[model samples]
Target chain A: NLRVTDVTSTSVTLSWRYRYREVTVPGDLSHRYTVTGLKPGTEYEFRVRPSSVSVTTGHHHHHH
Target chain B: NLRVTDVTSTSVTLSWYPWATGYRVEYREAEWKEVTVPGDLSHRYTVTGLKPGTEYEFRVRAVPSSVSVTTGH
Candidate 1:
């Protein structure tokens, strides 16, 4: 899965790279996510997964 | 002379009426005056002719109202 970074109050910069390993396979892909206008002092929950797999089945146990 | 009032960095407002008591009134009827800007308010003069990223000061004056006295004996 792609990675997100450089988060800010008014705006958030997003960056990612192509999953070369996944591209070698017939059914593999990657994706990135970014959110803005986030509350300054609040907890947030997020999850990331590869496009080739189903969210419900191949759910990676990750939280933020 | 018209008194200037409420001068701002970006704009200025002047108030006046038709001068019917002078011959120059007709000649001055179509004279170009007053810079034009959008969103002007009535009664209250607002001047905002200012440069970006700059500070400014302003002041206001009271304009004399038109005179119209009834003539009779």
Candidate 2:
């Protein structure tokens, strides 16, 4: 499943479960990656590298 | 900064000291709802129609900066 590791006003970090041999694509297979340069207070939809699972990012630290 | 100025059985008010372009108020019970309001021209928003004695998730955003809230009965 896809997971959010960190969120910021301009960035979001994502993580997911993965197996070594199961991955056939040609990118970082660390199971975790950070998506940067995003706008704040916005809603974003992230799909699994190439799957159907999706995740949403949260706001920075301004929640009450 | 973000503050929950008031809370009642059916509503919650939010106030902020300060935006990307405008402010967005997002709340969720069974599903999420959103309202985008003016950025610097206004500082607060009241979310209504909430179920009494229930907890709801909230988020306020100004294009980038965001605040999260949870309401209680």
Candidate 3:
């Protein structure tokens, strides 16, 4: 899941966490992103998606 | 003696002392003129001729209300 926080007049920061739920996976990962130079009174939209994928049985699937 | 105090962007209040019976006052800016009454403790009059965030200078003088006196600047 991803969350947006620290919103300000000129900048915004986003944070997310990625966990591998499978028992074979050994660790969880977290990431953060920031966007700046925003207008004083404007609206912005952003999207977040998984950065990596694992192939199993000739199929590519992404998990977050 | 007259003292000018409490000057702001759009208003000004003045005070003065007079040993005479009473005093008359007049204020003007350019072509417009306004008459005001004087108080014993401190005379106060507000003129709404100024714009916000603007600076202005005004002159006031006193004389008998019934008599005509040379207005001071």
Candidate 4:
């Protein structure tokens, strides 16, 4: 199954399967990919070979 | 502040500054290895030749601090 593994304010990490090991990115199948260069509090869709996962990015926080 | 700036499958980059006359960086994966940075102005270091998808602990002293980060795959 395509899974959402990790998410950051500007990136989302997805997990998928390949041969038998855990890898990153898809190329006949890999384990994960971090989609970067995104904005905070936004929504995006990722169309993968297996399925589609809609994601909402994290928020920006201020330290005061 | 001593911070981890970047991390790759086999390496980790670090940033430290404001200003320390000189610095020493130490990292451990299976064991610890130390690298010294001369008093320049860059205040950064990238420890190369590491294992992919592994965890590491780092420290900066020049009289200084510490942090930890993990490599990615």
Q: What TM-score, computed on C-alpha atoms, does each candidate reach?
A: 0.20, 0.44, 0.32, 0.52
Over the full model, what C-alpha lDDT does candidate 2 score relative to the true structure? 0.56
Ranked candidates, highest TM-score first:
4, 2, 3, 1
Give the alpha carbon lDDT tens digit for every residue of B11-66 in model 4.
66777644566778888973989999887575778888876545677887873456
TM-score of candidate 1 chain B vs. the reference: 0.26
lDDT of 1 by residue, B1-73 (tens): 3333322223333333232221111101103123332232333343343332222222222222211111000
Alpha carbon lDDT at B71, candidate 4: 47
Relative to the true interface, what fraction of contacts does candidate 1 keep? 0.00
Candidate 2 regions exceeding 4 Å error are: A1-63, B17-19, B64-73
Please write out the lDDT profile of model 2 over residues B1-73, one tens digit for every residue: 6766655445667777232677888877638789998767667788887764445667777752434433322
Number of clashing residue pairs, candidate 2: 7
Q: Write the per-residue lDDT of candidate 2 for residues A5-47, one digit (tens) a residue.
A: 4443445555666321102334565767666555544445555
The CAPRI classification for model 4 reads as incorrect
Alpha-carbon lDDT of model 4: 0.61
RMSD of 2: 13.0
TM-score of model 4 vs. true structure: 0.52
| Candidate 2 residue pairs in clash (backbone atoms < 3 Å) | A40-B63, A40-B64, A62-B67, A63-B67, A63-B68, A64-B68, B20-B62
Question: Which window of ten consecutive residues has the lowest lDDT sum in model 1 chain B?
Answer: B21-30
TM-score of chain B of 3: 0.46
DockQ of each: 0.01, 0.06, 0.01, 0.08
- Over 4 Å off, model 1: A11-30, A50-64, B1-73
**Candidate 3: stretches off by over 4 Å:** A1-64, B17-22, B53-57, B64-73
